[PDB]
Amino acid sequence: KPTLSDGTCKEEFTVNGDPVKKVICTGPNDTSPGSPRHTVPQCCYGFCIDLLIKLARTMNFTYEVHLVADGKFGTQERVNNKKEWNGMMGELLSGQADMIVAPLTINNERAQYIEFSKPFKYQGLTILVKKEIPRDSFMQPFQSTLWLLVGLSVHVVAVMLYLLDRFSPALTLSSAMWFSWGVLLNSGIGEGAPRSFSARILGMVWAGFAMIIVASYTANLAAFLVLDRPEERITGINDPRLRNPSDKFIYATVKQSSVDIYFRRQVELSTMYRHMEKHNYESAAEAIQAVRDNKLHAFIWDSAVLEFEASQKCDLVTTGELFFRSGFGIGMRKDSPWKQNVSLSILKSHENGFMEDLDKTWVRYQECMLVAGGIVAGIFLIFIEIAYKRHK
Amino acid sequence: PFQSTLWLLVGLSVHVVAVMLYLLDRFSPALTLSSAMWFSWGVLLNSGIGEGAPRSFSARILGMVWAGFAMIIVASYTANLAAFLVLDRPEERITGINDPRLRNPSDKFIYATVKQSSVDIYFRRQVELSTM
Amino acid sequence: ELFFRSGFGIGMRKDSPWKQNVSLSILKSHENGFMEDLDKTWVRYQECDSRSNAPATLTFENMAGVFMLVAGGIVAGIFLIFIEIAYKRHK
Amino acid sequence: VATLEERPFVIVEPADPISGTCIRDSVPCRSQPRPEKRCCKGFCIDILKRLAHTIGFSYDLYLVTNGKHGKKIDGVWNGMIGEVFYQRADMAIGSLTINEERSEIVDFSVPFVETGISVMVARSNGTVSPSAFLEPYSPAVWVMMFVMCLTVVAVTVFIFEYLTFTIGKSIWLLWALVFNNSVPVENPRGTTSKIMVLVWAFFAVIFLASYTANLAAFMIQEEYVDTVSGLSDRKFQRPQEQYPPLKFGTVPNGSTEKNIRSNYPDMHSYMVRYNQPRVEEALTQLKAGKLDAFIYDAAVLNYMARKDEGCKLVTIGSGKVFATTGYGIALHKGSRWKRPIDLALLQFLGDDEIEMLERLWLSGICHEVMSSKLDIDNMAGVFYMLLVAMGLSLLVFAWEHLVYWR
Amino acid sequence: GISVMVSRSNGTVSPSAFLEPFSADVWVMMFVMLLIVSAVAVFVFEYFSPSFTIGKAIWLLWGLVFNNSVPVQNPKGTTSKIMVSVWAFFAVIFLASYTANLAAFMIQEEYVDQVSGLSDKKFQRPNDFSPPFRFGTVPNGSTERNIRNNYAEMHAYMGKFNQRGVDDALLSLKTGKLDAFIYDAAVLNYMAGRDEGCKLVTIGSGKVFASTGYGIAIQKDSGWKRQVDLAILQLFGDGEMEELEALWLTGICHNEKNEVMSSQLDIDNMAGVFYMLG
């Protein structure tokens, strides 16, 4: 976050006291997107920064923190004719720094030039995709053709009553309409008990017609709902879609970092690696912002960063299965005398349970009609019929 | 469905919920015990035999909400019998050769084939599966 | 699931004079469907299958106890009449 | 090297009686006379086999006897650590857990499998959520329908005035239609008035039909429940609480006890009396009912919760792990072997071979709800609604003895 | 071999699905139990305290089993009121289970299917009874040669539906121009398992008719023929062949359990009930 007007760090608090610790932090501002600029003081704080202050207590430090120059993590590359390191690792081997406290994934290429101590946490690699929204549900279980056919059935069967009431060897026509309408709707309106066997023998099963039709109704919603389950979800690596892209499914990662190293050293993982070279994003938030805009179907990136995002936006859901278990770590040169004491003092944090407290503070605890109008849709019926009833 | 305790809890409930209607209307500015016995037993079982409705501005509110109580009991009863008629028989069926029971033998399972047949050739030639 | 797929064949001694003049009749019989007729008259016929997983055709085997409660209520009716009959004169 | 015996990682079996040697896909484990040359295999050993090949050296196995793992007794060690510490052997592979107390006197490689302290408990015989006022469409339809009935009843009364049929009597009819029927009512005789009731019914049937079907959904899927949140839960922290106290009994002599004895001293006062000599004999106690909790490693329990007892034995938190720490290979703190094998282990994670070994040995069967033949009395969702309904009835009842009296 | 793929035909057609819950045994005997208990009430209510007879004994008793909303005339006297009340308890259960089972039967439905095989009368008779039924195949190939030799009657009619290639035929399926495709099986199964929407299926759940196989053609009487075949047989042994198809020939649209994805019931499904009143 940028500084205040006079340069002092802004002040906040947690849910209960415990002031958030902050430290002055220098580095580039506009990320140099072709328009380089000088460094201006800023404020740096959070989970990793909360680790230095604990580390500075038992080791007698006077530390100053400056952000990276370019932005990338680090990767070997050949320049116009040797091999060198860009990103952070260029700065650690060039003597501009002595210790790296940031999310670094330890790997084979990096271990040959710097050591790593012992991990903060453990994680893997997952995929991030958008969600799918379900459907109101009023006229769900029937089709358009059904209503107009069952609806015409009541009147065509009601009239059969009257014909059987004027040839008896005590029902009027108006009451017959009510009795036919009532049984299906399950409502005690008036009295429509008929006489004579023939007129009654229809009334034996006519009520039973209400049973089956209504019975199937509840059957549908039980069937339709629990069995909706749209056929979806990407099941991690080795999915047929990933091995054979159809160019309608674009998936890319962050430039440099580690995933590029992973999908390059494996020879079989060459078809996808060719395709993603044209879509790599040079950030860790633009790609996330891109996925929410449906401009990028999939996204491969680190688990701890991705899982927190899913629990904060309530709009993106992870998937798949973890397939590269590698911890983070703290880096320093092959000759520093802090190798032994730094790595030992991380272990006495897991044993003492300290690293659980930082988890609670910084990661975990940030979890994120038509039928009704149908009752009101019939009000105009009385208004049109208000005068008609008066006339008759 | 349900459970023996619930029915007896319900069976005790109807009598105790019916009586307080009489105590409510009788000492208040036309009902009888049999009606109270009948009215409560009527709604839960959904029968028209119950005749005498309460006549006051305080008995209805207790009675009306009790008409709500009849919705949950029956509706739950239907909604639970569906559970016993969609849930399939639990069993861990043998899935191919990749199952860990095949790869890691146990004294519970016994494996049989036909002697000197093709399966014997197929098995006793691959070292990795040369385990069982 | 099937995990090693092959096929039964007709085996002969190597380099017999019928090596190539038999595997035409096996191979031609597939086109006529003659291999199909032998299949449906010696392999597949009436059976009891999985019938998917679980049907529902309720009957006495499970739905009979409720029919006893109304039967049980039949008897209690006779008892109730006599007590009802006598209690009228007690007033 | 030096190893021990563990069920899924490094397993010891007797030699072939006929040949007198070890079958293929095994390595000869001596069992320090030094008699009875045994055979050993497993997931851990296959790691040793590859590392010997890639780097190149000659090795012979050696099973420890003096104790199991480290426990500082008056400034001297035992077990695997008790042997690497005394130059008797260089490497010590197997089931070894990195900790602060051990990285002082020996070094460790980069861990290759995650572990930690985790809890294991027997599954219930069947459970389901109470879900008071089982959610039809969340607590929003409850608010809106209440106004709608009052809104339409005035509309009914509006046509009543055009025609005693008071509001209190007439509203009652408008409501008893929703909750099925069999509540005697008084329908009005207004011909054009009775029509709106017919449309009102169509709201009732659809609403009631929709509700009963949807409620089957929340009790057809289910997701079980959880019990005892974690280590810091009060059910553990104060064992001398009321009711039959729970039983923990972690196996002694290891990190799974040395951790607790430095952070929860009041825990260790009470857990002591319920010890178990070994691992397997603890599980039968758990299934029989002698104990009700277990504190051990994560890889061992999760594997042991997925082999045969995965039918009804699970781990709290759906696999939650506390104070995470990995396994690893010991060294001599100066053995200069650290640099090559450290690269080798990270090399294996580079490609995907560790997973291939992981899914060959540490595989599973089980992991999903039961029939729930209970409908237990613990519902209380509407019974509480019943009792709270009684109270509101009596509150307005006092108006009978007040308005008339005043 | 030779297979046939057709559209999903939307939801399955399951007529007479209403009667599936319960069985004919209880229905044929439940009804007579009402008549007996109706007579019992006449004996039960004969004494004490208005002419409730067998004429209305059924009508009141028949009303409840079919839910409610049947205007009736109640009996009288505390002697008989108990019987009709305990009869109601029999009405709730019969209703409660029947609904709680029909849906439980409908979820585990099975897909209807349309035609069986090339021997079906629909294929044999192109338009004799049903409206013009549409099918065709790509010529120049092998399946056309088999059709000509053994089914000469249907080879004349199906000449006016020739496609040009596998892709162009598939689009004509969705648009409804064509609704039956007869092509080589090893291509259809791969194609029908890797399509968006999973709306295409092979009849018979993997049905083939004239089983042949692929292969490597070699010049007549070549010296290599003895070694190539032995090499292929070895690939079966080590399982290389049995995992390559997991790399090129897999899909996502699982053809298991015959997933229906709702039925969206129509007029046709409830045909009998519209007949029962008829």
Ligand SMILES: *[C@@H]1O[C@H](CO)[C@@H](O[C@@H]2O[C@H](CO)[C@@H](O)[C@H](O)[C@H]2NC(C)=O)[C@H](O)[C@H]1NC(C)=O
């Ligand atoms: C855990 O370590 C203790 C430390 O000695 C062991 O305790 C002894 O056990 C042996 C018998 O196994 C006996 O000497 C005594 O009963 C114990 N005390 C002493 C002072 O020796 C204990 O055996 C170890 N636990 C296991 C399971 O091996």
Ligand SMILES: CN[C@]1(c2ccccc2Cl)CCCCC1=O
């Ligand atoms: C007709 N009875 C219904 C019902 C279902 C469940 C419980 C009681 C009842 Cl009354 C009401 C809603 C439509 C479906 C149905 O079966």
Ligand SMILES: *[C@@H]1O[C@H](CO)[C@@H](O)[C@H](O)[C@H]1NC(C)=O
């Ligand atoms: C280092 O830290 C110790 C205690 O943490 C303190 O006494 C000492 O003054 C610090 N500085 C030096 C130079 O030792």
Ligand SMILES: *[C@@H]1O[C@H](CO)[C@@H](O)[C@H](O)[C@H]1NC(C)=O
């Ligand atoms: C590392 O910590 C130990 C702890 O006693 C201390 O003696 C040693 O001097 C520390 N090393 C450095 C380089 O400060």
Ligand SMILES: *[C@@H]1O[C@H](CO)[C@@H](O)[C@H](O)[C@H]1NC(C)=O
């Ligand atoms: C091979 O088959 C042909 C069939 O046309 C037959 O004429 C011939 O005699 C056969 N030869 C042998 C050696 O069987």
Ligand SMILES: *[C@@H]1O[C@H](CO)[C@@H](O)[C@H](O)[C@H]1NC(C)=O
């Ligand atoms: C198929 O064969 C016919 C003649 O047999 C030929 O004219 C035609 O070009 C071939 N290809 C197609 C696609 O019809």
Ligand SMILES: N[C@@H](CCC(=O)O)C(=O)O
């Ligand atoms: N063997 C390790 C892990 C197993 C356990 O903690 O019991 C130890 O003794 O600490």
Ligand SMILES: N[C@@H](CCC(=O)O)C(=O)O
């Ligand atoms: N599989 C066939 C396709 C042509 C046909 O179906 O006849 C071939 O390769 O020739």
